[PDB]
């Protein structure tokens, strides 16, 4: 019955004792394979999202620095800034779950600043109580009722608890959501929840990829970011129509004038082309004729979602190459036996690794393709 002391000494120093360039590429080659599958899927550019955040006792855990509540709210502020930047003509609503009740903190509106203020205020209150998905879903269902049929009704839920207390039958609410064509995305924190999986599956035409559980703080930012892009529409769900909106013309007046939206004096504003009323900022629904007012820039922000740039396929080192320098940035390609050239099939022009990421992430037009004359 001897103890571990008498056996031997650990001898930690014994543990430690004293192609690579190809490895760095094959990983790049494999990663390009994942993104090679890109098709012009139809997407609903006009969105109506109801952001539901969990603020309960389970959100007081110390898993995420400093705590789940602070980080989720902190990421929520980031989400609003990114969402409206890439979805200018969409609207957002914010709900929170506290004391087994759903609390409205932001009405559906197209003004990003209003949502930011509400989120910042929520950052102070200490979360407590039990969550209630049914209360949140019912409130989200009501908030999305006064929305046009051409918009995409979506609900993003950040769930942190493993249990839910509801006053009624959750399955009935799930059935109502499907009838109302609302789409629900759930970002869990700890583990899968049976009701959440059913909600995400039955509500998304059986797809099970809309219920995501993070594995670290780095992944959580990726999960939040992925929700900014518009969600592809289902084939059998047809709501095609024409929406009447106008393009106002900016003015520059010498004296201040009252705004028809806030009844506040503002120097400059955009004049509606249907009733001549002035609005401080865009894009917003005109306060008089209920006609959406937007600029041409807002529409152009969503063209890349309808005509995605086809992926760039690697070029094997067996074949010869056209030029020693990048077409767009003329960055000399290191010789390294492997190649770093990325070619666009449409124009067959070599691109460096740096541009390829930039062209497909910041820009949305291939420099070579535009230069090429038909």
């Amino acid at each position: 019955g001897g103890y571990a002391w008498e056996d031997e000494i650990k001898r930690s120093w014994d543990l430690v004792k004293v192609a690579s360039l190809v490895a760095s590429i094959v990983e790049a080659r494999k990663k390009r394979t994942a993104k090679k599958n890109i098709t012009p899927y139809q997407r609903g550019i006009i969105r109506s999202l109801i952001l539901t955040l969990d603020c309960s006792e389970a959100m007081l855990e110390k898993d995420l620095r400093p705590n789940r509540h602070a980080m989720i709210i902190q990421y929520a502020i980031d989400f609003v800034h990114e969402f409206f930047d890439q979805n200018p003509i969409s609207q957002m609503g914010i709900i929170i779950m506290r004391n087994g009740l759903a609390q409205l903190v932001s009405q559906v509106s197209g003004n990003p600043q209003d949502h930011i203020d509400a989120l910042k205020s929520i950052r102070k209150q200490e979360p407590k109580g039990n969550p209630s998905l049914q209360n949140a879903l019912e409130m989200a269902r009501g908030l999305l009722l006064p929305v046009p049929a051409h918009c995409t009704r979506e609900v993003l839920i950040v769930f942190g608890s493993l249990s839910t207390t509801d006053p009624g039958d959750i399955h009935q609410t799930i059935d109502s959501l499907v009838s109302e064509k609302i789409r629900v995305k759930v970002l869990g924190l700890s583990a899968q929840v049976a009701i959440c999986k059913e909600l995400c599956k039955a509500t998304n035409y059986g797809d099970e990829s809309f219920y995501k559980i993070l594995l670290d703080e780095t992944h959580l930012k990726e999960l939040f970011n992925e929700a900014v892009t518009p969600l592809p529409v289902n084939k059998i769900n047809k709501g095609f129509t024409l929406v009447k909106m106008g393009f106002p013309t900016r003015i520059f007046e010498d004296t201040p004038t009252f705004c028809s939206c806030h009844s506040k004096l503002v120097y400059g504003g955009y004049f509606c082309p249907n009733c001549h009323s002035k609005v401080c900022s865009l894009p917003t629904v005109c306060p008089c004729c209920d006609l959406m007012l937007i600029l041409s820039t807002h529409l152009a922000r969503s063209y890349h979602h309808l005509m995605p740039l086809k992926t760039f396929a690697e070029v094997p080192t067996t074949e010869k190459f056209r030029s020693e320098d990048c077409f767009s940035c003329q960055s000399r390609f290191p010789i390294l036996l492997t190649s770093s050239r990325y070619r666009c099939e449409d124009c067959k022009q070599e691109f460096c690794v740096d541009c390829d990421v930039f062209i497909h992430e910041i820009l949305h037009n291939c420099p070579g393709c535009e230069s090429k004359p038909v």
Binding site: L162, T164, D169, I170, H171, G188, S190, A194
Partner: protein, 752 residues
């Protein structure tokens, strides 16, 4: 899919197939072709029932023999599950083959589960249901009605309506589950109980429980209808020894003997009343008895004996009645003095263990009852009761136990033992003597099955070790093997906790059940796991008494209050209906996301067939090894018998008996390879029992998890649950854990 074996085309009802199922199916076919018995153990996470039905049903439909299939389960709930799986296959086969082939599949259960009579189906016990149904279907009412229409005796419309149609037209071709069978019979006013029983001989596959195959009381009638060359499947047979033992066991109490005397006096009074007015019936029965006819000859096929045969059919004497009990009055006197002898033997002051031979000798001394008349006691009583017009048999019910005791004790002498204890319950103010007739050898009840049938398949999810079962039950197997599931990513996390967060050893030993340190450690473990378990958490206790005591202590200590915050508490109860209601509520809470925790007994009704797949079962908390009660006369005698005969050590069998129940509960949480859960065995004694677990469970149990703590186990559970929630990469499992049709063909080509 539709793949090919050496010469047998089999239609699988799914587009994909696991590697284990194909290997399992291949082995079963070889056993059937070569003939003999086999013991196949397959993980619970892989479809077993579908694989068995697919191959076996394909086997009969192709080969010229067209051998029938006999499926044996342990509970009625499993019968419905198999039938639903059975319906799935035939529906797929019908769609693929373009026609509904001639196939009949029915389940067999008691009247209580198949009685549609508005007044007879509202009983709380099956014995009363059988008596009432027999009264309306024995034929006495029909004969009396024919002679005199004015007779007030009633009939059963469901039973009567069957006579109009032929047996072959009772049900349409196909498979009829219990849910479907009741609906079809209700719409046409027919009796499902009589439909199935008269239709067993015409069923390609017949499904019933082990009691209908091992218990001689109900096995003889069903066994006579099934074929002799049929395929026999034993599903979930890891506790078949218990079923065999209880088939030939009996318990007698002072109340039973007291009630028996009342019945005996009533029979004597009834005989006198019949003698005065109608003596011809007695003479007619006596004349037939003198000739040498037995219950089979006199009784019509429509009626059944009052006392079910308690011994195997092969052990029944074929000679005439000895003569001492030939007449009604003489038999009553013979029956009465037998009861008196039993009563005086219950006045002992110490436990007495005696063999049947010694009991008979003492009986032959104090009184003058020989062995041979006792063997005919049950047979003679049924004839007497039949001829006495006993329409109400409430008083004579107690005499059935006495008749059973006489036949059992006078028939078997080896492998049986009689225990007389002055204290049925040691914690009682007044002694309550009890007499127990016990069967020690479990192979006696199963011996006829292994000889009558050529091929038998023994399959289960946690049948290990496979060598013990041939040792315990006297049979030999052509092949016995256990499969290891080829899962790409681990789906079940088996762990063993030997101490609490305080590092104090934890055990469920009965003598320290009321221990503040042990109770608190288990309660903290229960609370901590409920914090992280998403949907469902099942907890199994070694015994109901331990659960009752420990739960009460938790309530006083306030531990239950913390659990109530995160999950609803459902507790198994002695009442079967209440426990069933708890299961429905437990499942409802898991489905709706409220979260629930179920407290049950490892050797209870929940563990013997109820499965917690997917959300219902995510964490299994085994509180201690489910050891039996060591200080039990029944168990000690059985242990000695096995040690002397089969050379099985008492400790080894006790460990084997407890581990099989623990593993049984562990395997009720995985259905497919996408199901996941955490299995924690909370006892210091599980640490050295890793080799005793099923192979597929031992493989998943890592060395670092042999002895963990509550805090350490919780950390692993949190990490494991988080990992299992991530989207699985399809390429990691395309052809290593799940096979398509092309992948299966590759396997066949490579092997060949």
């Amino acid at each position: 899919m539709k793949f090919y074996i050496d010469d047998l085309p089999v239609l699988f009802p799914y587009p994909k197939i696991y590697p284990e199922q194909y290997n399992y199916m291949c082995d079963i076919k070889k056993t059937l072709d070569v003939g003999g018995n086999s013991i196949l153990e397959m993980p619970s996470g892989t479809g077993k029932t579908v694989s068995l039905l697919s191959l076996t049903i394909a086997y009969q439909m192709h080969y010229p023999e067209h051998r029938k299939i006999i499926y044996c389960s342990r509970t009625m709930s499993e019968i419905e599950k198999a039938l639903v799986e059975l319906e799935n296959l035939m529906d797929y086969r019908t769609k693929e083959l373009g026609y509904q082939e001639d196939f009949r599949g029915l389940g067999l259960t008691s009247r209580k589960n198949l009685c549609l009579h508005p007044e007879v189906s509202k009983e709380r016990k099956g014995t009363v249901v059988d008596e009432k149904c027999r009264r309306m279907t024995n034929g006495q009412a029909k004969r009396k009605l024919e002679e005199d229409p004015e007779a007030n005796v009633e009939l059963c419309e469901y039973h009567e309506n069957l006579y109009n149609i032929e047996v072959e037209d009772y049900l349409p071709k196909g498979v009829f589950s219990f849910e479907k069978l009741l609906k079809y019979c209700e719409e046409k006013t027919l009796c499902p109980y009589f439909i199935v029983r008269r239709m067993i001989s015409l069923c390609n596959i017949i499904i019933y429980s082990y009691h209908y195959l091992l218990d001689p009381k109900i096995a003889e009638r069903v066994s006579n209808e099934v074929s002799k060359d049929s395929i026999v499947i034993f599903d979930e047979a890891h506790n078949i020894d218990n079923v065999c033992i209880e088939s030939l066991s009996l318990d007698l109490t002072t109340d039973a003997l007291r009630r028996a005397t009342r019945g005996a006096n009533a029979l004597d009074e009834r005989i006198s009343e019949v003698r005065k007015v109608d003596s011809q019936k007695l003479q007619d029965e006596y004349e037939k008895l003198v000739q040498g006819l037995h219950s089979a000859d006199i009784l019509t096929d429509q009626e059944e004996p009052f006392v079910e045969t308690p011994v195997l059919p092969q052990d029944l004497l074929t000679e005439a009645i000895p003569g001492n009990i030939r007449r009604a009055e003489h038999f009553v006197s013979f029956l009465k003095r037998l009861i008196e002898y039993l009563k005086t033997r219950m006045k002992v002051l110490h436990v007495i263990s005696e063999t049947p031979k010694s009991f008979l000798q003492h009986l032959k001394q104090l009184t003058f009852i020989e062995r041979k008349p006792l063997r005919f006691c049950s047979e003679r009583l049924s004839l007497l009761v039949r001829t006495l017009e006993v329409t109400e048999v409430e008083d004579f019910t107690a005499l059935k136990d006495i008749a059973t005791f006489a036949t059992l004790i006078s028939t078997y002498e080896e492998g049986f033992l009689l225990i007389i204890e002055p204290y049925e319950i040691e914690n009682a103010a007044v002694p309550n003597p009890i007499m127990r007739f016990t069967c020690l050898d479990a192979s006696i009840a199963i011996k006829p099955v292994f000889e009558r049938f050529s091929s038998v398949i023994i399959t289960s999810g946690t049948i290990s070790p496979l060598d013990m079962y041939p040792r315990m039950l006297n049979f030999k197997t052509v092949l016995q093997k256990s499969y290891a599931m080829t899962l790409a990513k681990k789906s079940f996390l088996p762990m063993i906790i030997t101490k609490g967060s305080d590092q104090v050893a934890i055990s469920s030993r009965f003598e320290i059940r009321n221990d503040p340190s042990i109770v608190r450690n288990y309660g903290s473990m229960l609370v901590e796991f409920a914090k992280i378990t998403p949907d469902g958490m099942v907890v199994f206790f070694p015994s109901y008494l331990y659960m009752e005591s420990i739960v009460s202590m938790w309530q006083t200590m306030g531990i239950l209050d913390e659990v109530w915050k995160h999950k609803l508490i459902l507790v198994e109860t002695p009442d079967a209906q209440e426990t069933s209601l708890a299961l429905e509520t437990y499942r409802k809470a898991c489905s709706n996301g409220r979260g629930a925790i179920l407290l049950s007994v490892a050797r209870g009704k929940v563990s013997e067939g109820i499965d917690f797949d997917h959300q219902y079962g995510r964490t299994v908390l085994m509180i201690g090894i489910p050891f039996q009660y060591t200080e039990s006369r029944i168990l000690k005698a059985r242990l000695e018998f096995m040690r002397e005969n089969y050379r099985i050590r008492e400790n080894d069998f006790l460990s084997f008996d407890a581990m099989r129940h623990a593993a049984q509960c562990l395997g009720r949480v995985l259905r497919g390879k996408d199901d996941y859960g955490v299995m924690v065995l909370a006892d210091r004694r599980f640490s050295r029992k890793r080799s005793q677990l099923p192979k597929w469970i031992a493989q998943g149990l890592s060395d670092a998890d042999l002895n963990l703590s509550t805090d350490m186990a919780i950390s692993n559970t949190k990490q494991f649950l988080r990992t299992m929630a991530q989207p699985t990469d399809p390429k990691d499992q395309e052809g290593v854990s799940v096979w398509s049709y092309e992948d299966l063909i590759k396997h066949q080509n490579s092997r060949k």
